[PDB]
Design an enzyme around this catalytic site. Structure first.
Site, PDB file in Angstrom:
ATOM      1  N   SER A 130      -1.261   4.638   4.338  1.00 36.14           N
ATOM      2  CA  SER A 130      -1.672   5.373   5.542  1.00 36.14           C
ATOM      3  C   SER A 130      -0.782   6.601   5.705  1.00 36.14           C
ATOM      4  O   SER A 130      -0.771   7.444   4.795  1.00 36.14           O
ATOM      5  CB  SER A 130      -1.792   4.427   6.731  1.00 36.14           C
ATOM      6  OG  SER A 130      -2.606   5.058   7.723  1.00 36.14           O
ATOM      7  N   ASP A 176     -12.738   1.929   6.728  1.00 33.88           N
ATOM      8  CA  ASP A 176     -11.544   2.368   7.443  1.00 33.88           C
ATOM      9  C   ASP A 176     -11.906   3.219   8.655  1.00 33.88           C
ATOM     10  O   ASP A 176     -12.558   4.257   8.517  1.00 33.88           O
ATOM     11  CB  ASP A 176     -10.712   3.194   6.458  1.00 33.88           C
ATOM     12  CG  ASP A 176      -9.273   3.356   6.895  1.00 33.88           C
ATOM     13  OD1 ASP A 176      -9.020   3.410   8.114  1.00 33.88           O
ATOM     14  OD2 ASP A 176      -8.386   3.430   6.009  1.00 33.88           O
ATOM     15  N   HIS A 208      -8.841  -0.729   6.753  1.00 33.69           N
ATOM     16  CA  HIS A 208      -7.605   0.033   6.594  1.00 33.69           C
ATOM     17  C   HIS A 208      -6.438  -0.836   6.162  1.00 33.69           C
ATOM     18  O   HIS A 208      -5.482  -0.318   5.567  1.00 33.69           O
ATOM     19  CB  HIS A 208      -7.260   0.644   7.948  1.00 33.69           C
ATOM     20  CG  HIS A 208      -6.086   1.571   7.912  1.00 33.69           C
ATOM     21  ND1 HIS A 208      -6.104   2.772   7.232  1.00 33.69           N
ATOM     22  CD2 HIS A 208      -4.862   1.486   8.491  1.00 33.69           C
ATOM     23  CE1 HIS A 208      -4.944   3.384   7.391  1.00 33.69           C
ATOM     24  NE2 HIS A 208      -4.169   2.622   8.145  1.00 33.69           N
TER      25      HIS A 208
HETATM   26 CL   LIG Z   1      -0.468   5.271   9.656  1.00 35.66          CL
HETATM   27 CL   LIG Z   2     -10.169  -0.354   9.883  1.00 39.75          CL
END
Ligand SMILES: [Cl-]
Ligand SMILES: [Cl-]
Ligand SMILES: [Cl-]
Ligand SMILES: [Mg+2]
Ligand SMILES: [Mg+2]
Length: 263
Positions: A130, A176, A208
């Protein structure tokens, strides 16, 4: 033949297992023991040799625990790997980039002699989840000498990564909602040069947080990418080129690449 090759000739099954063939030792790095980052855990092979070294960052509000399984699994295939904590869990991607740099330097210069003696400091890679994946892209753009970069469900406000020359595998997750592939992973991949070694693996049926628990696909392609590019290990090209088929339900939405990859 290749002096950086480590471990047995690979198969899909070897890459999909809970552990590779190497025995992994752990070295704790406390917050105040780490200059320039928040500490971490170094996973390294007990087998005495030199290996490439990899630094992995978590995302916003995340800690090293969110990527620990992947750091250990990678180390077990023959790498020295640090999973970092950041100075604060609120740090933005470009700060995470410099903390990843500091963690690479930590492994080379500040860790124990056991760790330092096992590192070929000329063969380094970075990965992150991320915002940590955004930091991976930023550091790759600042350090063209890195051998590989793996942004996992990456997040960054900058969409243009045309300056990156480091072999980069981006792993996206189709479902995501935090770093949507339409506005993060795909623009990043599409802006990387067409002339570098790169690949985009989009997981199907994945959120995610797919990178934060053991995942056969993420482990397999992360290890194969690092073997091919950190070790120049052409025994691992077979997993990356042509790569997995698109449209495998709950597994692979698509896999794009610039195969064949130059040495
Ligand atoms: Cl993040
Ligand atoms: Cl998600
Ligand atoms: Cl696209
Ligand atoms: Mg162990
Ligand atoms: Mg510190």
């Amino acid at each position: 033949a290749n002096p950086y090759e480590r471990g047995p000739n690979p198969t899909d099954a070897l890459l999909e297992a809970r552990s590779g063939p190497f025995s992994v030792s752990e070295e704790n790095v406390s917050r105040f023991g780490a200059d320039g980052f928040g500490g971490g855990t170094i996973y390294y092979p007990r087998e005495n040799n030199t290996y490439g070294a990899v630094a992995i960052s978590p995302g916003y509000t995340g800690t090293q625990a969110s990527v620990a399984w992947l750091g250990e699994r990678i180390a077990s295939h023959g790498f020295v790997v640090i999973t970092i904590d950041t100075n604060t869990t609120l740090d933005q991607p470009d700060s995470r980039a410099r903390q990843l740099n500091a963690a690479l330097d930590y492994m080379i210069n500040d860790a124990s002699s056991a760790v330092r003696s096992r590192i070929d400091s000329s063969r380094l890679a970075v990965m992150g989840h991320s915002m940590g994946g955004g930091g991976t892209l930023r550091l790759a753009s600042q350090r063209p000498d890195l051998k590989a970069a793996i942004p996992l469900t990456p997040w960054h406000l900058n969409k243009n990564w045309s300056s990156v020359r480091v072999p980069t595998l981006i792993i996206g997750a189709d479902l995501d909602t935090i770093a949507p592939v339409l506005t993060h992973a795909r623009p990043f991949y599409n802006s990387l040069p067409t002339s570098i070694s790169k690949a985009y693996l989009e997981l199907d049926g994945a959120t995610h947080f797919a990178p934060n628990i053991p995942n056969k696909i993420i482990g397999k392609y992360s290890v194969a990418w690092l073997k091919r590019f950190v070790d120049n290990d052409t025994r691992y090209t077979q997993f990356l080129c042509p790569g997995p088929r698109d449209g495998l339900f709950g597994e692979v939405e698509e896999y794009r690449s610039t195969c064949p990859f130059a040495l």
